[PDB]
Design a protein around this ligand. Structure first.
Ligand SMILES: *[C@@H]1O[C@H](CO[C@@H]2O[C@@H](C)[C@@H](O)[C@@H](O)[C@@H]2O)[C@@H](O[C@@H]2O[C@H](CO)[C@@H](O)[C@H](O)[C@H]2NC(C)=O)[C@H](O)[C@H]1NC(C)=O
Ligand SMILES: *[C@@H]1O[C@H](CO)[C@@H](O)[C@H](O)[C@H]1NC(C)=O
Ligand SMILES: *[C@@H]1O[C@H](CO)[C@@H](O)[C@H](O)[C@H]1NC(C)=O
Lengths: 420, 592
């Protein structure tokens, strides 16, 4: 069902479909070191990704249905330069006819054109004045379904936001070449990241789209805040999803000492552009290998690892005393060589028992492989104390809503721009 | 029928006077005087509490405007309700009973407010405290009058007004002695804080408790027993009066010669009583507006309303004008520094009352600075750094911040007025109110001083009025004091400094007191014993409503012009004096 599918291979970009589409890459197109499949495009002419299709797969029919799917990561807009600056990233238009993808300030634009110069547009808008966003500088699964008979729809993360009729359009003659390049942006430091771009010759339903979403999500590998791979020996700022206005903090070091959720968070402000909440507050959480047989530094599901807490630019260890009062066990930061037999091995969870993808959960375990409980927080005398309790496992078994078992890992990113 | 009733009334009014003249004036009257003096001193204390604790409560409870205005009145509205309610109920339940109930209500809500943390709950508690102390002055005067013979009744009732002064002086002294200790931060509960002003509130609740204790040892007025058909109890109380007086005199052997006393012939269940009580009180209130008392009541209404309006207006106006003059002087002394370029320096300061305009700051570190009444205008801060910044009445207008960090600062969003921040970061913001709360320091002391001088100027007037009430007359005292109050109002033009305002406050306070004494005596003497507290309560509720209106109007005119307060006060007092000169003379008459 796939006609074009850009994937990575041995120092080249190829097409998985049985068409062998010619791909030309510019001399300044960059790739990541760990997830080299995803590609980055910068605001230069030489940042060129050129793909050429065959004459037998050119969109030149009159009721031909088609769809596209991709992932996009678009950074924060910092100043007033970026306002009202619709710039195209994906162009498939020849002789002023075809389909294109453009972006504005906090918008994703789907535009398709005919030979009669008719314009139909579908828009997703996301705010940038929010405290903590699920779209700013974070990977978004965007797919578009085009039904030439009824209408076209926009889908993000498998959910619908907007749809507009396209019945007025008569005939679309897309270009034989698809253009991936930032075009019409006045900001010299503006870039996007896309990955997993696929083409279809039929309007995908919600079932197929969700199937593709989870298939491409790599549920077997943990994802940090930005949606990238979570990595060993990398400092991560910690955000608790259920109470996202407090940051992990310390007061003392030892068994007596404890770690808690202190707040509220600060703010980074550029007036009338963004009023986000500071994400570089608190203590970093470095993750170290314990029994991972994999050679890479990527953290996968069911990996027993260690947790290193950076306090005053000094590394410590996450441990608890299993034998204590109550069901929840208070987390504490201990010296690495003075941990003794305290429970420190943690199991990192990516998906549920049924295999449903969810956020990051830390499952503290003892040396006997006994589940103390998922790492969370419990209030002691108006103090939010980090605890590990079986209660979260109980709600999981009862298919209830857990409260405090979900965490996000926030590394320092250039796309966020916050001063640390 | 009605004439027969009136004849019975007049007969009882003469025999009671004869019995009281037999009993004589002595120890009983003076003991009761001191007891009811405590009750009145509570009232005197009550009207200072919120004025003295507002500067501290505004910061400690985040009080905005229209929230420090409804706490500056709430006592007057509470007393409005209380006066009417307890004065109405005192003619069906008894003077001492209703006085006990009202004082207890006042004390309870006062200790409770000493601990309340929010504003709405504090407003409610303090409203209810006002409701409780509102029935003190009607009941007290109408209770002391039912033990006095006609020989010296104005003097003995006028001596009873020293107590409101003794309460004002008490409040001022305790505010001076307690509130200035801002260090006191007693902690009981993490979310709650207990400061010095709460201690002041408790100590201000104390005299009401003492009043309850003192009153529990006094007998109900015999006249109330006689009106309501209870003959034995009235005989008992009169015998007690006579016995106490004669034992104190030095002749504890003579016998109470009165054997029979003329008495007015009387012609689920909880709610039943509640209805009957309401009906009886309403009947008494409407009978106050009867054919026999409709002219008298209307001049009393006029006199009470006009005097209260003028007195309260000017009394709240004088301290407002003093602050306004202080504010004008403070604005005159402000410093301006036009145009600056500071670069690459760690630079703290403790700057007060300044304006910086046109500055250009680059790579500046501002660690540990106190800002009081400092404004930065038309400034530019670029890669600046603010740490441990304490801000009071400090603003940034038309300012531009670029790559600046505010670490551990109280620079909230309301302190940047029409500013532009670019890539700015706020971290570890201090706890503070969402809006400006101002701050009062040394001025408190002088405030107290002023109060002490405005409730001490009243003293000569009290003394003279008490001495001369019986010799001169109620109408002459009231008129001669209202007219001189009007002349003092005219004199308000020749004062523009704080010292002049203090002297003028003392003058007006010293002048108006005799008038208010006369009016209290006159309104006790002018009503029958079965409606005295209902009438006096209605006219003392009208007084508190006039107080609210006058306070609002006269504080609305501060800093605008002096003509409005002078004209309003002089007009009101002239009309009050004119109406007072039309009232009947009650000197040398039996208490009918
Ligand atoms: C606001 O900051 C961003 C990010 O820069 C970070 O924050 C600064 C306050 C400072 O601490 C830098 O060292 C941080 O890296 C700016 O956007 C980037 O600016 C850098 C230059 O410092 C440039 O190399 C990048 O390409 C920019 N990224 C993008 C997507 O434009 C932004 O320019 C700052 N705002 C202004 C008005 O300058
Ligand atoms: C702050 O100012 C004082 C003098 O007012 C100065 O002595 C001090 O050094 C300054 N702070 C620092 C950290 O330099
Ligand atoms: C201050 O004045 C006006 C705003 O009222 C503005 O045009 C001007 O640029 C401001 N000054 C600076 C230095 O920004």
């Amino acid at each position: 069902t796939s006609i074009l599918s850009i994937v990575y291979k041995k120092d080249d970009l190829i097409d998985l479909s049985r068409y062998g589409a010619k791909i030309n890459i510019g001399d300044r197109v960059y790739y990541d070191s760990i997830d080299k499949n995803q590609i980055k495009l910068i605001n230069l002419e030489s940042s060129t990704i050129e793909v050429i299709l065959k004459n037998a797969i050119v969109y030149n029919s009159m009721y031909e249905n088609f769809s596209t799917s991709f992932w996009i990561k678009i950074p924060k807009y910092f100043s007033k330069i970026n306002l009202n600056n619709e710039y195209t990233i994906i162009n498939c238009i020849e002789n002023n006819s075809g389909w294109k993808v453009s972006l504005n300030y906090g918008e994703i634009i789907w535009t398709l054109q005919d030979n009669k110069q008719n314009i139909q547009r579908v828009v997703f808008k996301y705010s940038q004045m929010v405290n903590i966003s699920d779209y700013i500088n974070r990977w978004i699964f965007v797919t578009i379904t085009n039904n030439r008979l009824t209408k076209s729809k926009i889908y993000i993360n498998g959910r619908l936001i907007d749809q507009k009729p396209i019945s007025n359009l008569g005939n679309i003659h897309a270009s034989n070449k698809i253009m991936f390049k930032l075009d019409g942006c006045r900001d010299p430091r503006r870039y996007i990241m896309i990955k997993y771009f696929n083409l279809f010759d039929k309007e995908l339903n919600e079932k197929e789209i969700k199937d593709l979403y989870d298939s491409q999500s790599n549920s077997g590998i943990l994802k940090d805040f930005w949606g990238n791979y979570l990595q060993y020996d990398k400092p991560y700022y910690m955000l608790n999803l259920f109470d996202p206005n407090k940051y992990v903090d310390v007061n003392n070091i030892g068994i007596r000492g404890y770690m808690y959720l202190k707040g509220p968070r600060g703010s980074v402000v550029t007036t009338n552009i963004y009023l986000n909440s500071t994400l570089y507050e608190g203590t970093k959480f470095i993750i170290k290998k314990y029994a991972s047989g994999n050679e890479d530094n990527i953290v996968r599901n069911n990996d027993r690892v260690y947790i290193n807490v950076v306090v005053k630019n000094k590394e410590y260890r996450l441990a608890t005393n299993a034998s204590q009062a109550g069901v929840e066990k208070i987390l504490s930061a201990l010296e690495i060589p003075d941990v003794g037999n305290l429970s420190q091995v943690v199991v990192m969870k990516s998906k549920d028992d049924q295999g449903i993808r969810n956020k990051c959960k830390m499952n503290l375990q003892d040396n006997n492989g006994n589940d103390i409980g998922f790492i969370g927080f419990h209030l002691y005398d108006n103090i939010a104390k980090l605890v590990a309790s079986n209660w979260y496992n109980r709600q999981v078994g009862k298919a209830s809503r857990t409260f405090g078992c979900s965490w996000e890992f926030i590394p320092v990113d250039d796309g966020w721009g916050e001063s640390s | 029928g009605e004439a027969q009733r009136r004849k019975e009334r007049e007969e009882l009014a003469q025999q009671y006077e004869a019995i009281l003249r037999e009993c004589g004036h002595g120890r009983f009257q003076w003991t009761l005087y001191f007891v009811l003096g405590l009750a009145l001193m509570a009232d005197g204390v009550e009207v200072f509490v919120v004025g003295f604790v507002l500067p501290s409560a505004e910061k400690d409870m985040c009080l905005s405007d229209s929230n420090k205005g409804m706490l500056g009145l709430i006592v007057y509205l509470g007393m409005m309700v209380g006066a009417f309610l307890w004065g109405g109920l005192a003619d069906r339940l008894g003077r001492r009973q209703c006085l006990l109930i009202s004082l207890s209500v006042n004390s309870v809500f006062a200790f409770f407010s000493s601990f309340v943390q929010g504003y709405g709950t504090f407003l409610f508690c303090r409203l209810l405290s006002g409701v409780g102390i509102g029935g003190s002055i009607p009941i007290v005067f109408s209770y002391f009058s039912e033990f006095l013979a006609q020989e010296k009744r104005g003097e003995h009732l006028s001596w009873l007004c020293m107590f409101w002064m003794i309460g004002g002086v008490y409040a001022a002294a305790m505010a001076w002695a307690i509130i200035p200790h801002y260090g006191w931060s007693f902690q009981m509960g993490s979310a709650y804080q207990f400061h010095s002003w709460r201690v002041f509130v408790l100590v201000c609740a104390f005299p009401s408790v003492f009043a309850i204790g003192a009153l529990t040892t006094q007998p109900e007025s015999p006249r109330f027993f006689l009106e309501n058909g209870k003959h034995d109890e009235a005989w008992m109380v009169l015998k007690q009066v006579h016995d106490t007086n004669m034992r104190a005199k030095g002749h504890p052997e003579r016998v109470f010669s009165v054997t029979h006393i003329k008495t007015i012939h009387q012609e689920q269940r909880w709610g039943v009583r509640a209805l009957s009580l309401g009906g009886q009180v309403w009947g008494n209130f409407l009978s106050c507006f009867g054919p026999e008392y409709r002219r008298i009541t209307l001049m009393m209404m006029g006199v009470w309303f006009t005097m209260s309006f003028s007195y309260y207006g000017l009394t709240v106006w004088f301290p407002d004008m003093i602050r306004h003059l202080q504010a004008v002087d403070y604005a005159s002394r402000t410093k301006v520094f036009p145009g600056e370029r500071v670069e690459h320096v760690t630079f703290n300061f403790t700057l007060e009352n300044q304006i910086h305009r046109g500055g250009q700051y680059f790579n500046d570190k501002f660690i540990g600075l106190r800002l009081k009444s400092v404004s930065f205008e038309d400034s530019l801060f670029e890669e600046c750094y603010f740490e441990d910044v304490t801000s009071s009445n400090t603003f940034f207008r038309n300012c531009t911040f670029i790559n600046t960090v505010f670490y551990n600062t109280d620079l909230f969003e309301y302190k940047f007025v029409n500013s532009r921040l670019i890539n700015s970061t706020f971290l570890h913001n201090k706890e503070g109110c969402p809006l400006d709360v101002t701050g009062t320091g040394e001025g408190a002391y002088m405030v107290y001083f002023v109060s002490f001088l405005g409730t001490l100027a009243v003293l000569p007037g009290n003394i003279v009025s008490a001495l001369l009430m019986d010799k001169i007359g109620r109408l002459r005292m009231l008129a001669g004091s209202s007219v001189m109050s009007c002349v003092s109002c005219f004199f308000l033009s020749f004062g523009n400094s704080e010292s002049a305002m203090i002297a003028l406050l003392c003058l007006f306070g010293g002048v108006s007191i005799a008038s208010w004494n006369a009016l209290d005596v006159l309104t006790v003497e002018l009503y029958p014993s079965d409606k005295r507290t209902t009438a006096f309560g209605f006219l003392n509720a009208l007084c508190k409503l006039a107080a609210v209106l006058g306070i609002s109007i006269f504080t609305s005119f501060v800093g605008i012009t002096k003509a409005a307060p002078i004209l309003f006060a002089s007009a009101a007092l002239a009309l009050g004096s004119s109406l007072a000169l039309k009232l009947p003379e009650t000197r040398g008459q039996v208490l009918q």
